Amino acid sequence: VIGTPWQKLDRPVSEEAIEGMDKYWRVTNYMSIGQIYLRSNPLMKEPFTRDDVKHRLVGHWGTTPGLNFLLAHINRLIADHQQNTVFIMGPGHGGPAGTSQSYVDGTYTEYYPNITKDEAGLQKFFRQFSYPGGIPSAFAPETPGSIHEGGELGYALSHAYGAVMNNPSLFVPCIIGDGEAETGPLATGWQSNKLVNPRTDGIVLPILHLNGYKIANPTILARISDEELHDFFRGMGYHPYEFVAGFDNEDHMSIHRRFAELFETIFDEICDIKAAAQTDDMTRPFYPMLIFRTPKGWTCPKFIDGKKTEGSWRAHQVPLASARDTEEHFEVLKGWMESYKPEELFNADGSIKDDVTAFMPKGELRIGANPNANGGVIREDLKLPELDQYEVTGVKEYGHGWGQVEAPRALGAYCRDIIKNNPDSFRIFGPDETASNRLNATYEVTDKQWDNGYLSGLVDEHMAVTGQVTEQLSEHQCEGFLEAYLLTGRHGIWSSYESFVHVIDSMLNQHAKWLEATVREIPWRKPISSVNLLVSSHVWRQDHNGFSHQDPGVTSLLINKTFNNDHVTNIYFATDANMLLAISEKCFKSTNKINAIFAGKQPAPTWVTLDEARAELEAGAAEWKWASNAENNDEVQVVLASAGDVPTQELMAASDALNKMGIKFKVVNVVDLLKLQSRENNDEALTDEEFTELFTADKPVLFAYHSYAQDVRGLIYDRPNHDNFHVVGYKEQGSTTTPFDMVRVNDMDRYALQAAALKLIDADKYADKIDELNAFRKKAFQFAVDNGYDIPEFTDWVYPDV
């Protein structure tokens, strides 16, 4: 247990704490401006000159003094209440406030010993911000206290709420930009309070950083009427409080006293909600939220060159862009830095006075030190049930290609038992698709958590105020909840219809970049569990839906995060259920990855045994010797290669026809896609020798690919024999139609695959056979048209074991 959670003070904030908060605010304002502007001479010792100003002024002042003010008060809160606390910096461009925070709390020097607590350290701290060889401009993963960089805006609230799931002692003040609140993902994020439980989860306090402006515009929320702003948050299930400061001549000490008192009313109400939830955990309370209305750029010069700067979008980035070049700008910078009176805040040796920091929390309650903000220090391996019990044994008993299993059901049974073994640290998310993607065996041990109205057991099933499944019709919520759940040291998986995974492409990009920075250069940030995404209800079998639901292209996005041997991205094609089991165990053990696990949920053949799946997964690609009919590679007329459940089904049927014609070939299945890349691009891929052994040195390869053929072409560009690969993939063809038609129109059906194989072998010789196969596809199509279902010869085919 960290600290003493949800305790009220029952006394006013002390005058000593108010004095320390104003010193904090002034010192973090001063150091934030030093980080942006100063290359040397951080204490402005004589001579202080333009030569001390950075040649390239980059970074953001506007948001920053409001964040420094809240951080003073959140620090004071944490210390007085001993409250386990992670904050979210929605306006992540306020990096300097987050680095100042860590430098003041002592974690910066603890994690970065060269950046010491004295004039030499402070000089280096100022120079390195946004600087070549230095540190980023945003609240990056290399800052102690960050679980959310906030570079791409919109995910502040999904992260805040994912962090408090199953974390009942944790408090998350979530600082949201008022421009950020104009984004889609943030706008839906407010509604998460219908999906957390006040007894079993922790508490988010949204703080709207209503500074009136985004980069070059006012914001929507700051200019609507007060009555609309309050109704809006009340209608989203919050009790709105609002604080207004900085627009008149009110002295800063009164501002701190008024804010501390308000913040204590807010926290008392959170503590009442937490206490009440021990007895009534079914009534959804109105959680407080805070509207925090202060001037953008607060405490910078009111006007610069005749233009209003404090209280304006002009304060957004870097005021005084000529601070190095003019002297008029230099004098303004100088008076601005002086207004904080650093001579009272730093000792002669350049260490921050004890005065400034006596009110601060200590030890693991410090914002930089809390292990929830470095959740790998708390993560434990999952207690995984043995895989063998889930195996589809029909392939051992009856043969390769047996049955009509719905593959994700085996993963559901496995997830069920994971939740049973790990009842408060493994969650499932879905955007209203958990049952649709067949992971509903999980409901045998838990419910979808829903903290909003109930009506009737005739309609409410597998749903309760507490539980380990979470659904909301929003891929942004599912992805963002899961990310923070992982970043705070827990585990889980989510599932999405494949085409809609694209809604969150850009979130995958940011989490991949968080991982990249981390595996490269932040070894104190310990490994977290991986994002595990079941990509299902795929392009080939969207039976109730049509062309809008046919887009397997997240493969292609993921290919753009496969650099430098970071190894933070995996693309797996689950050939069948036993392959799915083997991939999933590996993903549930992995850390520091995004794993995209492709599987069909339609009834489908099971191809491999579990033991086979386990060996084939590890190689990445394997020959299926029981399916090949060639003696060796020299006798092979074509390589039949497949990635995905449906391409594999269609290639298998093609191999069966090709065998019966006396064509000699081998069958290669591809599971771990990126292991096709060269060793030069991927030090864990198949070696050239292993690749040649699979795909031959010079025979034609027919490659039937689940997604866009572009992917495979670009990946094998420098591989031996790559010029002989013919890649067939999805090509933007299809609609609401039968299963054969959907493969037919992309040349993916078995008849077209057989034809393509014949054509690669000898186009002249098999010209008639090819015609005949093409004519057969037409006839099968007409049959579907005339009759309403696919030709029995297509649907009834099973691979020659039985």
Ligand X SMILES: CC(=O)c1sc(CCOP(=O)(O)OP(=O)(O)O)c(C)[n+]1Cc1cnc(C)nc1N
Which positions make up the binding site for thiamine diphosphate?
63, 93, 151, 153, 179-180, 211, 296, 316, 500
CB 129 within 8 A of CB 59: yes
User: Nearer Cβ to a second copy, position 555 or 575?
Assistant: 555
CB 360 within 8 A of CB 75: yes
> CB of residue 139 vs a second copy: minimum separation in angstroms?
10
User: Nearer Cβ to a second copy, position 284 or 490?
Assistant: 284
Token digits for 604?
């489908």
Q: Measure the CA angle with vertex 300, ends 298 and 305; round to 5°.
A: 130
> CB of residue 105 vs ligand X: minimum separation in angstroms?
22
> CB of residue 614 vs ligand X: minimum separation in angstroms?
33
Burial code of 578-612, b = ≥16 C-beta within 10 A, e = fewer?
bbbbbbbbbbbebbbbbbbbbbbbbebbbbbbbeb
User: Nearer Cβ to ligand X, position 139 or 588?
Assistant: 139
> CB of residue 725 vs a second copy: minimum separation in angstroms?
9
Report the candidate in 315, 495, 331, 497 with the shortest Cα–Cα distance to residue 415: 495
If contact means CB under 5 to 8 A according to the sort of partner, which of Na ion, a second copy, ligand X, none does residue 358 touch? none
If contact means CB under 5 to 8 A according to the sort of partner, which of Na ion, Mg ion, a second copy, none does residue 714 touch? a second copy
User: Nearer Cβ to a second copy, position 228 or 354?
Assistant: 228
User: Nearer Cβ to a second copy, position 223 or 362?
Assistant: 223
Task: Please identify which residue in 22, 178, 269, 585 interacts with Mg ion, judged by CB under 5 A.
Answer: 178
**CA 559 to chain centroid:** 16
* Strand locations in 83-135 (E): 88-89
Stretch that binds ligand X, among 173-181, 509-517, 583-591, 653-661 (CB under 6 A): 173-181
Task: Please identify which residue in 141, 162, 168, 177 interacts with ligand X, judged by CB under 6 A.
Answer: 177
Report the candidate in 216, 193, 219 with the shortest Cα–Cα distance to residue 204: 193
Q: Indicate the pairing of strand 491-497 with strand 531-536.
A: parallel
Token digits for 328?
């008029």
**CA 325 to chain centroid:** 42
User: Nearer Cβ to Mg ion, position 256 or 316?
Assistant: 316
Helix (H, G, I), strand (E, B) or coil at 448: strand
Residue 178 found at the interface with ligand X (CB under 6 A): yes
CB 668 within 8 A of CB 641: yes
Task: Please identify which residue in 98, 173, 179, 644 interacts with ligand X, judged by CB under 6 A.
Answer: 179
CB 500 within 8 A of CB 542: no
User: Nearer Cβ to Na ion, position 285 or 480?
Assistant: 480
> CB of residue 658 vs a second copy: minimum separation in angstroms?
24
Residue 215 found at the interface with ligand X (CB under 6 A): yes
> CB of residue 245 vs ligand X: minimum separation in angstroms?
16
**For residues 682 and 564, what is the distance between their CA atoms, to the nearest angstrom?**
8
> CB of residue 550 vs Na ion: minimum separation in angstroms?
18
> CB of residue 798 vs ligand X: minimum separation in angstroms?
31
Token digits for 442?
């999980």
Q: Indicate the pairing of strand 531-536 with strand 594-598.
A: parallel
Could you tell me which residues come within 8 angstroms of residue 766 by beta carbon, excluding any fewer than 6 positions away? 758, 759
Task: Tell me how far CA of residue 236 lies from CA of 83, 287, 534, 560, 775, in angstroms.
Answer: 26, 10, 31, 38, 59
Instruction: Find the binding residues for Mg ion in span 187-216 (CB under 5 A).
Output: 211
Q: Cβ-count burial of 384 within 10 angstroms (0-12 exposed, 13-18 middle, 19+ buried)? A: middle
If contact means CB under 5 to 8 A according to the sort of partner, which of Mg ion, ligand X, Na ion, none does residue 215 touch? ligand X
Instruction: Find the binding residues for ligand X in span 29-68 (CB under 6 A).
Output: 62-63
Sequence letter at residue 671: V
H or E segment to which residue 406 belongs: strand 402-406
Site string for ligand X, 325-364 (x = CB under 6 A): ----------------------------------------
Which residues participate in the annotated binding site for Mg(2+)?
178, 211, 213
The dihedral over CA atoms of 80, 82, 84, 85, expressed in degrees to the nearest 10, equals: 10
Stretch that binds ligand X, among 209-217, 400-408, 577-585, 731-739 (CB under 6 A): 209-217
Residue 546 found at the interface with ligand X (CB under 6 A): no
User: Nearer Cβ to a second copy, position 366 or 593?
Assistant: 593
> CB of residue 212 vs ligand X: minimum separation in angstroms?
8
User: Nearer Cβ to ligand X, position 474 or 575?
Assistant: 474
If contact means CB under 5 to 8 A according to the sort of partner, which of Na ion, Mg ion, a second copy, none does residue 211 touch? Mg ion
User: Nearer Cβ to Na ion, position 110 or 152?
Assistant: 152
Q: Tokens 């809240």 sit at which residue?
A: 70
**DSSP-assigned letter for residue 385:** P
User: Nearer Cβ to Mg ion, position 137 or 211?
Assistant: 211
Residue 431 found at the interface with ligand X (CB under 6 A): yes
CB 568 within 8 A of CB 585: no
- Phi, psi of 40, deg, nearest 5: -155, 165
Task: Please identify which residue in 131, 286, 398, 500 interacts with ligand X, judged by CB under 6 A.
Answer: 500
> CB of residue 176 vs ligand X: minimum separation in angstroms?
8
Ordered DSSP codes for 44-57: -PSS--GGGB-SS-
Which residues participate in the annotated binding site?
63, 93, 151, 153, 178-180, 211, 213, 296, 316, 500
Greatest alpha-carbon pair distance for the chain in Å reads 95
Residue 162 found at the interface with ligand X (CB under 6 A): no
Q: Tokens 């079941």 sit at which residue?
A: 534
Instruction: Find the binding residues for Na ion in span 486-505 (CB under 5 A).
Output: 503
Q: What is the binding site for Na ion (CB under 5 A)?
A: 503
Q: What is the binding site for ligand X (CB under 6 A)?
A: 62-63, 91, 93, 152-154, 177-180, 183, 209, 211, 213-215, 219, 296, 316, 431-432, 473, 497, 500, 503, 545, 549
